[PDB]
């Protein structure tokens, strides 16, 4: 009855949700995704025109792969763990890009989703780009909640 007005009130919305555990592929869009990064959104825009040549598509892929390389080579500088003790809560990381006048990124991991000696893959957030003019000395930079 919490899910009444959205899902259970009508047979159509009920059958849509009940099937979604069994047949998600009826509802999966290769274009849209929840949790989709900004890299994939920029990729989708780069191929959102009518005339898609093989060379147009290849150049959109190498632009994607350039921005892929940038978040893949982030160097973790420092971190902060939000709870008073290490087992619960979130740890917030700070990453640095490989540029001079470097760029800073942050991401989090949830220690509650650590299970059987391993973080689950959904414990991690995306790297989020920090838009602030940051220029630390000897990487003396720390996050804090």
Partner 1 sequence: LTDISHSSFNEFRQQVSEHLSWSETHDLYHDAQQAQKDNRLYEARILKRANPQLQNAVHLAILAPNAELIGYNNQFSGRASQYVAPGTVSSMFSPAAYLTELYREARNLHASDSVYYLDTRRPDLKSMALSQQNMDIELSTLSLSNELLLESIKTESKLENYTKVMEMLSTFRPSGATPYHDAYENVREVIQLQDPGLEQLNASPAIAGLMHQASLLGINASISPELFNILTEEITEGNAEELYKKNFGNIEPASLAMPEYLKRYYNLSDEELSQFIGKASNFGQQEYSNNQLITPVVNSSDGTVKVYRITREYTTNAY
Partner 2 sequence: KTVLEKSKAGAQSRFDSYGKLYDENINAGENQAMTLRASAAGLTTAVQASRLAGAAADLVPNIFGFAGGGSRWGAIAEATGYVMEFSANVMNTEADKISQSETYRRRRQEWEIQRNNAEAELKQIDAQLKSLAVRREAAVLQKTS
Partner 3 sequence: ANRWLKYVWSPSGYIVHGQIQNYQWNVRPLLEDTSWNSDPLDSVDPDAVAQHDPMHYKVSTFMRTLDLLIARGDHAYRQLERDTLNEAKMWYMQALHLLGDKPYLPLSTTWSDPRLDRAADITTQNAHDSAIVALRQNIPTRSANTLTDLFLPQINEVMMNYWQTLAQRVYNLRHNLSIDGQPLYLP
Taking the complex as a whole, how short is the minimal distance between the CB of residue 92 and partner 3, in angstroms? 20
Q: What is the DSSP string of 59-98?
A: HHHHHHHHHHHHHHTPEEEEEEE-SSSTTSSEEEEEEE-S
Cβ neighbours, 10 Å, residue 76:
11
Nearer to partner 1, 52 or 120 (CB): 120
Residues shown for the chain: 145
Nearer to partner 3, 22 or 137 (CB): 22
Site string for partner 2, 3-42 (x = CB under 8 A): ----------------------------x-----------
Nearer to partner 1, 1 or 137 (CB): 1
Of 4, 22, 23, 25, the closest CA to residue 14 belongs to 4
Does position 73 interact with partner 2 (CB under 8 A)? The reply is: no
With CB under 8 A as the contact rule, the residue among 5, 10, 14, 20 that binds partner 3 is 20
Partner from partner 1, partner 2, partner 3, none binding residue 99, C-beta < 5-8 Å depending on class: partner 2
Place of tokens 């191929």: 47
Helix (H) or strand (E) holding 45: helix 38-46
């Amino acid at each position: 009855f919490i899910d009444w007005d959205k899902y259970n009130k009508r047979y159509s919305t009920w059958a849509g949700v009940s099937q979604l555990v069994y047949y998600p592929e009826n509802y999966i869009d290769p274009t849209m995704r929840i949790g989709q990064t900004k890299m994939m959104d920029a990729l989708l825009q780069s191929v959102s025109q009518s005339q898609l040549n093989a060379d147009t598509v290849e150049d959109a892929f190498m632009s994607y792969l350039t921005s892929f390389e940038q978040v893949a080579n982030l160097k973790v500088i420092s971190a902060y763990h939000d709870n008073i003790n290490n087992d619960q809560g979130l740890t917030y990381f700070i990453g640095l890009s490989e540029t001079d006048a470097g760029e800073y990124y942050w991401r989090s991991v949830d220690h509650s989703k650590f299970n059987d000696g391993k973080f689950a893959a959904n414990a991690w957030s995306e790297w989020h780009k920090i838009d602030c003019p940051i220029n630390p000395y000897k990487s003396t930079i720390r996050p804090v909640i």
